Write a protein that binds this ligand. Structure first.
Ligand code: FAD
Ligand code: FAD
Lengths: 339, 337
């Protein structure tokens, strides 16, 4: 059939590949197109800090916690392969700092080497008085997208620069199944007021001497609203602002002063570090991920649509669970239609 | 006081700065000079991986364990300064890998978060069964000598590019005190059967994705001679164990392959690492450090010599304790006048 995938971020390409891997052979070719108005380096995925860490509390949906662990073990299976780093993948250890005792997270056993910080370690951080150490994985969004873009291309999947104006335009274009991987902009094709823009701004620096990640938490302020330092492959990511409901795509001086001063308080060696750039992106924030099937009809046309959007703060930490799951839903469509 | 420090590696320059910090005030006539046939970047100190880790089993001199511990506390007390990475200093986390269970080292509680590797960690390393995880410090030899040089220079200490043929000749130059930090070449000025060269070839690569050191210890053998991978401030250092007794400064194809093949199998992502250099150094291997005082009469020419050499593959790890010790013994020269 004719599958169209709208969106070239981590969700869009994890999904296009996951589907194509399973539902393709040499005498059952599955025609996949990828329509998208933004490709790497210009997606929200290229901004993502890179790191694998879910939210501290165990999530409401029991499927989301599976999607996290399935994602972790999928990436961890590549650690030791010659091409881990070429996917944007490498191991990284680090600190999570709190201003007060909190329960161990639900993923203490998912990560490698979890443990509490000793008193000696906590004096390294004057402003904080409790926390953890653990080993995890960098998945550099910019790289992973380059790699996924190439695996798709080897397999014959084709890409088109195209702003989809409605699901119908793509339906009349002659598309049997559509995968809706438009992230924060999903609300334009079909309204969805539960989906807000999580506006985060980051500073990227050269500070290759920084090797561990350092993630502070403010529980009052919620996730990403407190300084984090994340070592990348070529550069350190500096962050600490996340504004839910702000659609301003401009970088601004208020966020710079917050990220810069907060991060220099943790890591004073950053006074020298050259700023390479500053970027803003929109987490597709949503109380839950919309990952479901929905048939549509129009005047001269009708179609099958699968949603994969609203991952918010955890696109890379969950993309593969979400993709495996879309490919099953897609399997159901081919089962029901005698293909 | 006329002091001559022979040597411009870590030992000589740390020892010159201790001495000066602790005595420029009290002794108003204090003139220190640094003689060396090599300065940075040509010292064995510069070749080193720059990593705080003592030897696995315990030392012979128990003084050595306290000099190590003193060094760690000193460097750690700069973690928090804005000028730690300009000093050559930054934390690093990493893995020690073994082919059998071994007792925990005497330094487990000096380093941060010392701990055994779990099974999924050990699954990441197919040819290894046991190990430790801990967070230590990188002290980049090259960058630290630079810091040390600028410090000593504001302080007025004078440097001279110059080869010493004997202790005798420095002493007739008016040298009251001679601090002997000549590393592996110390035998030239006074025979020492115990001092051999730990020759170690290394490969510097451009591989900034690697955030953790990985050290192997193949205590018998298994072709690869314990490959290690140590991330630096910019480049990574690949290497093996020392070949003791070898004085050959030339790089050889035999050792390149051992190191490259052996480390590539430790960390396969090394396949696309740009090689930036390949250098050979000589550790001052000796069953225990020689940190002691000795006097020399060459007629009615009087001189105090304080030896601070023989630090093995651990001189960056132990430097500051020794430098401090040599400060004390220098006081007990001043004391006797
Ligand atoms: C500062 C910051 C740091 C973050 N750090 C991390 C992190 O460390 N770890 C983590 O797991 N997650 C992190 N995230 C979250 C992560 O960025 C997102 O969850 C993820 O990138 C969203 O993936 P996506 O593919 O749904 O959307 P996107 O990456 O934005 O991709 C959307 C694609 O759909 C296309 N599109 C949209 N509408 C249309 C249309 N009408 N027609 C055609 N194409 C369309 C776009 O052009 C684009 O190609 C972070 C977010 C921010 C802001
Ligand atoms: C491959 C390698 C890796 C290593 N890795 C580590 C590590 O990760 N961590 C660690 O702690 N240690 C490490 N070391 C050990 C460390 O390099 C040595 O212990 C340390 O450099 C010894 O310092 P030094 O000042 O005694 O020697 P050097 O740096 O060799 O300094 C010797 C000085 O004496 C001078 N000199 C000698 N004779 C004369 C003379 N007659 N006249 C004038 N000048 C003279 C030389 O020119 C030089 O200035 C490593 C060594 C090697 C070879």
């Amino acid at each position: 059939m004719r599958v169209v995938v709208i969106g070239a971020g981590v969700i869009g390409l994890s999904t296009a590949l996951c589907i194509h891997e399973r539902y393709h052979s040499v005498l059952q070719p599955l025609d996949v197109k990828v329509y998208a108005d933004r490709f790497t380096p210009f997606t929200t995925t290229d901004v993502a800090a890179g790191l694998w860490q879910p939210y501290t509390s165990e999530p409401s949906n029991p499927q989301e916690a599976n999607w996290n662990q399935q994602t972790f073990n999928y990436l961890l299976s590549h650690i030791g392969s010659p091409n881990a780093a070429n996917m944007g993948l490498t191991p990284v250890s680090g600190y999570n700092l709190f201003r007060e005792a909190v329960p161990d997270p639900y993923w203490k056993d998912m990560v490698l080497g979890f443990r509490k910080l000793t008193p000696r370690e906590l004096d390294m951080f004057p402003d904080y008085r409790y926390g953890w150490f653990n080993t995890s994985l960098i998945l550099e969004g910019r790289k992973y997208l380059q790699w996924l873009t190439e695996r798709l291309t080897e397999r014959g999947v084709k890409f088109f620069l195209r702003k989809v104006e409605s699901f119908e335009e793509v339906a009349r274009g002659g598309a049997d199944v559509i995968i809706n991987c438009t992230g924060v902009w999903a609300g334009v094709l079909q309204p969805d007021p539960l989906l807000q823009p999580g506006r985060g701004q980051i500073i990227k620096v050269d500070a290759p001497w920084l090797k561990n990640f350092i993630i502070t938490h403010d529980l009052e302020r919620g996730i990403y609203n407190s300084p984090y330092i994340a070592p990348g492959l070529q550069a350190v990511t500096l962050g600490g602002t996340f504004q839910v409901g702000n659609w301003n795509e401009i970088n601004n001086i208020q966020d710079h002063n917050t990220i810069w001063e907060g991060c220099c308080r943790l890591e004073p060696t950053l006074k020298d570090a050259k700023i390479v750039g500053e970027y803003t992106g929109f987490g597709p924030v949503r109380p839950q991920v919309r990952l479901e099937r929905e048939q549509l009809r129009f005047g001269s046309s009708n179609t099958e649509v699968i949603h994969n959007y609203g991952h918010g703060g955890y696109g890379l930490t969950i993309h593969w669970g979400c993709a495996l799951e879309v490919a099953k839903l897609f399997g159901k469509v081919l089962e029901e239609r005698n293909l």
